[PDB]
RNA sequence: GCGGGGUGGAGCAGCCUGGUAGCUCGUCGGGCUCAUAACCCGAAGGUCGUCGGUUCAAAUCCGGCCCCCGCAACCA
RNA sequence: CCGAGGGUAGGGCCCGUGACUGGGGCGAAGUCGUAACAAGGUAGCUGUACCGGAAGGUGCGGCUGGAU
RNA sequence: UGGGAGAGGGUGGUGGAAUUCCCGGAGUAGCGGUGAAAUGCGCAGAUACCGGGAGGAACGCCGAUGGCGAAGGCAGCCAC
RNA sequence: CGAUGUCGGCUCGUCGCAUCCUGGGGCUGAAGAAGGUCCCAAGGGUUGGGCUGUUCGCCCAUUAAAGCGGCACGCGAGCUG
RNA sequence: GAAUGCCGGCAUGAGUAACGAUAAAGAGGGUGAGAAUCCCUCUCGCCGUAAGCCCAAGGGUUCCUACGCAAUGGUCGUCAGCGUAGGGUUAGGCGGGACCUAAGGUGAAGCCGAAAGGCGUAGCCGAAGGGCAGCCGGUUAAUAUUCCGGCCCUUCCCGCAGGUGCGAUGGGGGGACGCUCUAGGCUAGGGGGACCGGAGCCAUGGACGAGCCCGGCCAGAAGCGCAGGGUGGGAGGUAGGCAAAUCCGCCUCCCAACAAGCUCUGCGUGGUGGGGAAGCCCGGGUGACAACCCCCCGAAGCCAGGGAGCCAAGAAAAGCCUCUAAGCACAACCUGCGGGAACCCGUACCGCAAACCGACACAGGUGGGCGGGUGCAAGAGCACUCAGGCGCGCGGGAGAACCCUCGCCAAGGAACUCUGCAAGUUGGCCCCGUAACUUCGGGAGAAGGGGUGCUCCCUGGGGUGAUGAGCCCCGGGGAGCCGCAGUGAACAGGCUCUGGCGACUGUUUACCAAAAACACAGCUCUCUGCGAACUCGUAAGAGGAGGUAUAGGGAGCGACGCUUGCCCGGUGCCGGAAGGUCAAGGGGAGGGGUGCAAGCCCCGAACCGAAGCCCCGGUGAACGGCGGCCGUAACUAUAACGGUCCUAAGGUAGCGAAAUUCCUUGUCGGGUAAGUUCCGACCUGCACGAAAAGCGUAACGACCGGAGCGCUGUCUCGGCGAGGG
RNA sequence: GAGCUAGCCCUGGCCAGGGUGAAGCUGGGGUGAGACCCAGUGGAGGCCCGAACCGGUGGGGGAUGCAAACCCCUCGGAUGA
RNA sequence: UGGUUCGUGGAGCCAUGGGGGAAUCUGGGCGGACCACCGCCUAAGGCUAAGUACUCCGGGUGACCGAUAGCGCACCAGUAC
């Protein structure tokens, strides 16, 4: 339930911030936080390879457990739900009966002080992880390994989820958050339920400064530039694109499909995305 | 206003210094030439 | 300056490829209707902007003149 | 001290008027169509939405004050 | 206090018929549509038939001149 | 073209006369007053404002009159821009 | 003899401009061959959130002293940051190293690249970050937390005693963190004292005083006192912290919980060691047995790792504590005490500048701390002033024009000009009061007005203390006094009405443009299923992202409001297993060369044969495009209506002489005495129009228009005065 | 060659004083309970005024300069992109 | 595809990044597409003086310079700046 401000500044008119209601702990588990190296968009050559990045708030990276088969059968208690600035979702702190502590990302409806567990025989109850084949067909699910033992890859962003449609052999058919129908291997783990913090998309950053807080530096349009800088650069006064709208590097940017043609995973995608 | 020369003994030494020269091929050939020409000082004097 | 046009009453084909001008509307006479329109059957009307030339023969090809749009008239 | 009123500044209400603009009423014999009264030739009316030279048309839902 | 009837309302659950679309099969020269047609769709294999899948929406018979609500209004089934 | 800096304004003027006013005249379809037209005449004078970058032009209020040109469309080693 | 030739010399301009902030000078005395310029004294002025003091960077003997004046110094020079010579920088505690890690750099392993080289986990290097033991005073011409004095402390080595399962580059804890706001108690610093110490002073009309002037402290171990921070104790189980673990984590059990206790800082006190003024006398000596106390103000600094709220969610490693492991318990470590040991480098001086960066002793540039007092509402603002430091390295005269900076002005008041350009006006505080419109915040300091000093009297509340006095802080009422004037000096908005453009705060052409331009939240399209797309790279490898479609790349549009129409024929993109074309390769009908021949060698048709192109569709917040002629109504005029040619389709809502209208100063209305601009309308829109968005929009703007009030030397129209030339 | 300048990374530091007064919280009120209203408390913000600091709007001076971008008056930002 | 005079040319020869892939003398390469004949030569392992190139160094000699010449430097020069 996003929070509103009164229009006591120009920017507070539309600025909205998250409610943080589901959060119970306001400083991270010291045993699970390591420093996050800000890059500013530059690679090991020193070159900007992703434009308009930098200048954002300092952050500590929280180690997240995307391979919950690491601890089969060991029930954990949900001890907290915390902010993670490296994510759109929230994270939940788990106290295993083992004594070990880990971070998973928080599904919607997960309550502190409840049990979760992972394994082939786990109950079909929000927050539990099972290999995809044992989850009943029709279930919503998140944090899905794209390949067995390689790590939870799909549906990790706030509010997202994947639904299980059916099976054929060693594979189950998933409706991804995009609408794509894909075969994913049944031995791939997945956590039941959709990711929490669904109102994340309903936030209005409100002013330019908020973008700078998130590390996002001002984007400058090709039309604003000169021909030495962009296909859209130049012109006396304003100017329409005057050619197929291109990127800074020459390729067309309004429809040109860029997925590799002979990519071996094509055998497993069933229906390309919707909308 | 603010001019271009803003001296700094660490910057001077780590940029034009002797050990900076020997590390790269062009730096070595710089020292090679200044030797050949007979320069009294092959690298800037900066007293740390 | 460059380009395209002028032909029955109105709006357009024919000109490029010389001989023969055609389409819709309108106009005239007749039908149907109690009557009008619509509709149906028939018919008339154009020397092709003008003068000159080529030709056996010019709406048609070449030249001038009249006119109509369209484009340009930049560095100053 | 108060004090008629004069002066400066800012409000409120009404009245007349105003290039132009909106529809309205009325006007013996204008132009276009034919929406309604017969099932009026697509039953009509209706609240709303969108559209159209115009009456209107159409979608959604409702009413019979609809025929057979 | 003891009982009854009911599409009264809200939440969640779920069941079948139908249409569209998708895939496999089999199959051929038309399908569709109207007052009559054309547009459209079909040898790039449609229409018609069978099997599988996805999804949304509305609840056939019961059903009635019926029942419920203050009105607007309320119809598969189950539970709160 | 191994550089002769543009329009307009401001400042400072100076000359020409094809004269706007003032002085002297002839003719008048000149009664007077006031005009028309032409001749002589360059001594002096020839206003303030609204609009526009404007020169010009239109307008307001006056005026004896609100003249027209030349001086590198006078004048940026004088100003403005 | 010429090349705006080259190098050098010397002219011309010319005794000309200038001699570098307008903070400012004058006299006496001295030194000396020589003095506006050096030394001393008295008087005058300037800075004083500095133009004073202290660090850092950079500079590198410029520091102190003697002797010098050729050049350097914009003049002079006896002087100097100049010449010559001598002297001067002292550390276990300050800073750096023998400690740690950050970005980054490097790089056993490993990967990659013609060569050169590029990557890369560990590890190593890397600091103004972490960690770590010295405070006060004296002394030199010149160094001082470094020498000396006083009082403290750290580490290493060996020894003694007491205690313990001792032991680590391995495990764990800790270190360890943001932004704003902030409590309590202190310290720095400051104000006052009718108290304490002091050489003195009585003037020029008065005062021998509760007179004037000066000063009234700094450091300190243990112990104690005040204020804080940090911190539960025990037991059982244990599968996790990549071996172990008695530690940590997880579970249950029993006690203590705003406490207390234990520990750790700050402040006060503290044995003791130092300091100690004005004035006088020659940096010294005296004052002086100096005194060293009371009250108030009081931090942004301290207690500190304090508290609270918020979102944008806020380093690492070591020291340190704990756990164990090999090994070892003749050890080893922990504690207390003693003796010994404790290396290298910096240390002068300048340091908002005459010593650094600007060719200069250059009106420019340069990070951190301290930065006193009074009054003005506050303050680091402003005026004066303390400590301290200066008068800016050419002067003297004169009293023109003209230039600069400044003061004033009769009557008028924008008549100036492209334009109120510039300069006036307004100006802080307290109180009264405040419109359209609005997104209900705003517009707003709207507008406009009153008050403001000093004296006497009465009184309300707060802090400290005690609840009282005292000092200090917010106030209210009554009566008066004076001047032209009471924020009496200085610092301190002119206002309003209405358009255009851009929502807004922001950004930009360093050195002619700060804008209407860029950015911006927000909207849409499109790409991307992750070894993502995209980007940098030959590659390895990186960014993307330790992210996963509520995400990431690209593009246009640009808050918000109401909206965004028709065209897919062309171009782009997307879809389409048919057809057409199509390269190498397959195929080899059929020819050729050569040989006696077996054979070797060459050419070569049909046919099969990818993408691309053709072809069939889709697609506009994709590139883009959105007609002409003629006729028609019972006055005229004009056409709701009609005819016909064309097109892929013929511009919709809204707006319109516009940042767009050529003809144009269109026409009409408003405002003006007068209006090529302005504002409101009309619509024959040369040549608006809907995300190169269309039409509006409160708020905002050193943006560009128009008008008005206020006020003025802008002007009629100039005059006088000041200072630097 | 990034000791100027531009962006980013890591690590530190700086921003006098005054003004306005969001949410929340407390109490009151209101209702079936609510929404909501009022007062107090609170101290939010690419909020407002104005030094330091960062700028460079208009004008004047300077133009073989004090200066190869300076000086004076004035003006913008100043808890934030 | 490179080398050769050889730029696709009748394009051999020498070399070789890709593909296919033998033989040991009765074997193999060459004589400018190719074939016959006639000849030359023995690939896929290595080494090898001398004659040749150069002048930092030393000496000798000039119809070479003679301080603006001759080396940038006759001299404390790759210095000062
Ligand atoms: Mg909001
Ligand atoms: Mg939340
Ligand atoms: Mg990263
Ligand atoms: Mg790197
Ligand atoms: Mg590199
Ligand atoms: Mg990029
Ligand atoms: Mg970037
Ligand atoms: Mg994310
Ligand atoms: Mg989160
Ligand atoms: Mg799989
Ligand atoms: Mg958003
Ligand atoms: Mg961020
Ligand atoms: Mg963005
Ligand atoms: Mg942009
Ligand atoms: Mg551009
Ligand atoms: Mg541009
Ligand atoms: Mg470039
Ligand atoms: Mg290019
Ligand atoms: Mg280009
Ligand atoms: Mg372009
Ligand atoms: Mg452009
Ligand atoms: Mg442009
Ligand atoms: Mg244009
Ligand atoms: Mg466009
Ligand atoms: Mg174009
Ligand atoms: Mg393009
Ligand atoms: Mg897909
Ligand atoms: Mg600079
Ligand atoms: Mg620097
Ligand atoms: Mg340095
Ligand atoms: Mg340094
Ligand atoms: Mg450096
Ligand atoms: Mg070096
Ligand atoms: Mg280097
Ligand atoms: Mg080498
Ligand atoms: Mg030497
Ligand atoms: Mg060098
Ligand atoms: Mg015709
Ligand atoms: Mg035709
Ligand atoms: Mg033709
Ligand atoms: Mg005919
Ligand atoms: Mg009859
Ligand atoms: Mg008829
Ligand atoms: Mg003829
Ligand atoms: Mg003829
Ligand atoms: Mg013909
Ligand atoms: Mg009166
Ligand atoms: Mg009808
Ligand atoms: Mg009808
Ligand atoms: Mg009909
Ligand atoms: Mg009808
Ligand atoms: Mg319709
Ligand atoms: Mg067919
Ligand atoms: Mg077929
Ligand atoms: Mg569906
Ligand atoms: Mg010329
Ligand atoms: Mg010349
Ligand atoms: Mg010249
Ligand atoms: Mg000249
Ligand atoms: Mg006369
Ligand atoms: Mg007369
Ligand atoms: Mg008369
Ligand atoms: Mg005259
Ligand atoms: Mg004019
Ligand atoms: Mg002219
Ligand atoms: Mg004109
Ligand atoms: Mg007269
Ligand atoms: Mg002339
Ligand atoms: Mg001229
Ligand atoms: Mg001329
Ligand atoms: Mg001319
Ligand atoms: Mg001229
Ligand atoms: Mg000039
Ligand atoms: Mg001029
Ligand atoms: Mg001129
Ligand atoms: Mg001149
Ligand atoms: Mg001249
Ligand atoms: Mg100009
Ligand atoms: Mg100008
Ligand atoms: Mg000659
Ligand atoms: Mg020359
Ligand atoms: Mg020369
Ligand atoms: Mg010379
Ligand atoms: Mg000489
Ligand atoms: Mg000379
Ligand atoms: Mg001479
Ligand atoms: Mg001379
Ligand atoms: Mg001379
Ligand atoms: Mg002269
Ligand atoms: Mg000079
Ligand atoms: Mg000067
Ligand atoms: Mg000054
Ligand atoms: Mg001055
Ligand atoms: Mg004197
Ligand atoms: Mg003197
Ligand atoms: Mg002297
Ligand atoms: Mg002298
Ligand atoms: Mg002096
Ligand atoms: Mg002296
Ligand atoms: Mg004296
Ligand atoms: Mg002061
Ligand atoms: Mg120096
Ligand atoms: Mg001298
Ligand atoms: Mg001398
Ligand atoms: Mg001498
Ligand atoms: Mg000198
Ligand atoms: Mg001298
Ligand atoms: Mg000098
Ligand atoms: Mg001298
Ligand atoms: Mg002397
Ligand atoms: Mg010394
Ligand atoms: Mg010591
Ligand atoms: Mg050692
Ligand atoms: Mg290290
Ligand atoms: Mg090399
Ligand atoms: Mg290497
Ligand atoms: Mg290093
Ligand atoms: Mg180091
Ligand atoms: Mg350090
Ligand atoms: Mg830190
Ligand atoms: Mg230390
Ligand atoms: Mg101490
Ligand atoms: Mg000391
Ligand atoms: Mg340890
Ligand atoms: Mg911590
Ligand atoms: Mg915050
Ligand atoms: Mg103290
Ligand atoms: Mg005080
Ligand atoms: Mg005494
Ligand atoms: Mg265990
Ligand atoms: Mg377990
Ligand atoms: Mg501490
Ligand atoms: Mg004594
Ligand atoms: Mg501070
Ligand atoms: Mg602290
Ligand atoms: Mg690290
Ligand atoms: Mg053992
Ligand atoms: Mg033993
Ligand atoms: Mg022990
Ligand atoms: Mg050593
Ligand atoms: Mg020292
Ligand atoms: Mg100093
Ligand atoms: Mg300064
Ligand atoms: Mg400083
Ligand atoms: Mg100095
Ligand atoms: Mg110097
Ligand atoms: Mg300079
Ligand atoms: Mg000086
Ligand atoms: Mg200076
Ligand atoms: Mg004081
Ligand atoms: Mg005083
Ligand atoms: Mg006072
Ligand atoms: Mg004040
Ligand atoms: Mg002076
Ligand atoms: Mg000064
Ligand atoms: Mg001076
Ligand atoms: Mg004189
Ligand atoms: Mg005055
Ligand atoms: Mg006066
Ligand atoms: Mg006056
Ligand atoms: Mg006035
Ligand atoms: Mg006035
Ligand atoms: Mg005016
Ligand atoms: Mg004038
Ligand atoms: Mg202007
Ligand atoms: Mg003032
Ligand atoms: Mg009003
Ligand atoms: Mg109001
Ligand atoms: Mg408004
Ligand atoms: Mg309001
Ligand atoms: Mg006021
Ligand atoms: Mg007020
Ligand atoms: Mg009063
Ligand atoms: Mg007084
Ligand atoms: Mg102000
Ligand atoms: Mg703006
Ligand atoms: Mg807007
Ligand atoms: Mg915007
Ligand atoms: Mg904006
Ligand atoms: Mg700002
Ligand atoms: Mg510029
Ligand atoms: Mg420029
Ligand atoms: Mg700048
Ligand atoms: Mg420049
Ligand atoms: Mg400028
Ligand atoms: Mg600006
Ligand atoms: Mg500028
Ligand atoms: Mg820009
Ligand atoms: Mg933009
Ligand atoms: Mg939007
Ligand atoms: Mg969207
Ligand atoms: Mg690339
Ligand atoms: Mg990563
Ligand atoms: Mg734009
Ligand atoms: Mg609105
Ligand atoms: Mg559109
Ligand atoms: Mg349309
Ligand atoms: Mg199209
Ligand atoms: Mg198409
Ligand atoms: Mg198309
Ligand atoms: Mg087109
Ligand atoms: Mg067509
Ligand atoms: Mg519409
Ligand atoms: Mg118009
Ligand atoms: Mg107009
Ligand atoms: Mg407009
Ligand atoms: Mg236009
Ligand atoms: Mg024109
Ligand atoms: Mg016009
Ligand atoms: Mg015009
Ligand atoms: Mg006009
Ligand atoms: Mg008027
Ligand atoms: Mg208008
Ligand atoms: Mg018109
Ligand atoms: Mg148009
Ligand atoms: Mg607006
Ligand atoms: Mg507005
Ligand atoms: Mg603005
Ligand atoms: Mg701004
Ligand atoms: Mg602006
Ligand atoms: Mg005005
Ligand atoms: Mg004047
Ligand atoms: Mg004077
Ligand atoms: Mg930099
Ligand atoms: Mg730097
Ligand atoms: Mg910081
Ligand atoms: Mg600040
Ligand atoms: Mg105030
Ligand atoms: Mg309050
Ligand atoms: Mg505040
Ligand atoms: Mg602000
Ligand atoms: Mg304010
Ligand atoms: Mg300036
Ligand atoms: Mg000004
Ligand atoms: Mg200049
Ligand atoms: Mg300045
Ligand atoms: Mg100023
Ligand atoms: Mg200001
Ligand atoms: Mg401000
Ligand atoms: Mg501030
Ligand atoms: Mg060759
Ligand atoms: Mg060849
Ligand atoms: Mg090969
Ligand atoms: Mg043989
Ligand atoms: Mg053989
Ligand atoms: Mg061979
Ligand atoms: Mg041979
Ligand atoms: Mg041969
Ligand atoms: Mg041979
Ligand atoms: Mg052999
Ligand atoms: Mg051989
Ligand atoms: Mg060989
Ligand atoms: Mg031999
Ligand atoms: Mg040899
Ligand atoms: Mg020799
Ligand atoms: Mg000779
Ligand atoms: Mg010589
Ligand atoms: Mg020589
Ligand atoms: Mg010679
Ligand atoms: Mg030599
Ligand atoms: Mg030599
Ligand atoms: Mg030489
Ligand atoms: Mg020489
Ligand atoms: Mg030398
Ligand atoms: Mg040198």
Through-space separation of residue A72 CA and nucleotide F28 C1' in angstroms = 135
Query: Residues of B from 1 to 40 whose C-beta is within 7 A of strand I: which are they?
Result: 37-40
Alpha-carbon dihedral of residues A9, A14, A15, A16, nearest 10 degrees? 140
B28-39: buried (b, 16+ CB within 10 Å) or exposed (e) per residue?
A: eebeeeeeeeee
End-to-end CA distance of chain B, in Å?
27
Question: Is the torsion defined by CA of A45, A47, A48, A49 positive or negative?
Answer: negative
Core vs surface per residue A112-131: b (16+ CB within 10 A) or e: eeeebbbbeebeeebbbbbb
CA distances from B43 to A80, A197, B5, B26, B37 (A): 62, 62, 18, 14, 13
Judged by DSSP in three states, A145 sits in strand
Question: How many Å separate Cα A14 from the centre of its chain?
Answer: 25
**CA of A218 relative to ligand 241 center, distance in Å:** 58
Please state, in angstroms and rounded to a whole number, the distance separating the CA atoms of residues A22 and A24: 7
Phi, psi (degrees; rounded to nearest 5) at A188: -75, 130
* Resolution, expressed in angstroms to one decimal: 2.8
| Ligand 216 centre distance from Cα of residue A222 (Å) | 28
Give me the residues near strand H, CB below 7 A. A 5-6, 8-12, 15, 37-42, 46, 48, 54-56, 58, 207-210, 212-213, 215, 217-218; B 1-8, 11-12, 15-16, 20, 44
What is the number of the ligand closest to the CA of B38? Answer: 36
The closest nt to A163, taking CA to C1', is E54
Nucleotide nearest residue A31, measured CA to C1': G241
Cα gap B2→A77, rounded to integer Å: 62
In angstroms, rounded to a whole number, what is the distance separating the alpha carbons of residues A60 and A93? 16
Give the position of tokens 């694109």.
A241
Tokens of A262: 């002979």
């Amino acid at each position: 339930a996003v929070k509103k401000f009164k229009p006591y500044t120009p920017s507070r008119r539309f600025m909205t911030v998250a409610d943080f209601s589901e959060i119970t702990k306001t400083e991270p588990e010291k045993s699970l936080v390591k420093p996050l190296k800000k890059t500013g968009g530059r690679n090991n050559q020193g070159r900007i390879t992703v434009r308009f990045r930098g200048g954002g708030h300092k952050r500590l990276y929280r180690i997240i457990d995307f391979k919950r088969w690491d601890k089969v059968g060991i029930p954990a208690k949900v001890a907290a739900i915390e902010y993670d600035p490296n994510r759109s979702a929230r994270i939940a702190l788990l106290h295993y009966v083992d004594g070990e502590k880990r971070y998973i990302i928080a599904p919607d409806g997960l309550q502190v002080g409840q049990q979760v567990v992972a394994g082939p025989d786990a109950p079909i109850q929000v927050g539990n992880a099972l290999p995809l084949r044992f989850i009943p067909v029709g279930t919503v699910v998140h944090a899905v390994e794209l390949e067995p033992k390689k790590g939870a890859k799909l549906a990790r962003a706030a509010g997202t989820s994947a639904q299980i449609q059916g099976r054929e052999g060693d594979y189950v058919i998933l409706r991804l958050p995009s609408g794509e129908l894909r075969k994913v291997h049944g031995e791939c783990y997945a956590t039941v339920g959709a990711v929490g913090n669904a109102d994340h998309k309903n936030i209005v950053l409100g002013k330019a400064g908020r973008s700078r807080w998130l590390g996002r530096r001002p984007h400058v349009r090709g039309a604003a530039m000169n021909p030495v800088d962009h296909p859209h650069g130049g012109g006396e006064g304003r100017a329409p694109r005057g050619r197929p709208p291109a990127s800074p590097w020459g390729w067309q940017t309004k429809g040109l499909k860029t997925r590799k043609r002979r990519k071996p995973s094509s055998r497993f995608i069933i229906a390309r995305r919707k909308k | 206003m603010k001019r271009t020369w803003q001296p700094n003994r660490r910057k001077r030494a780590k940029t034009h210094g002797f050990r900076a020269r020997m590390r790269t091929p062009g730096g070595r050939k710089v020292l090679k030439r200044r030797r050949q020409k007979g320069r009294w000082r092959l690298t800037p004097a900066v007293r740390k």
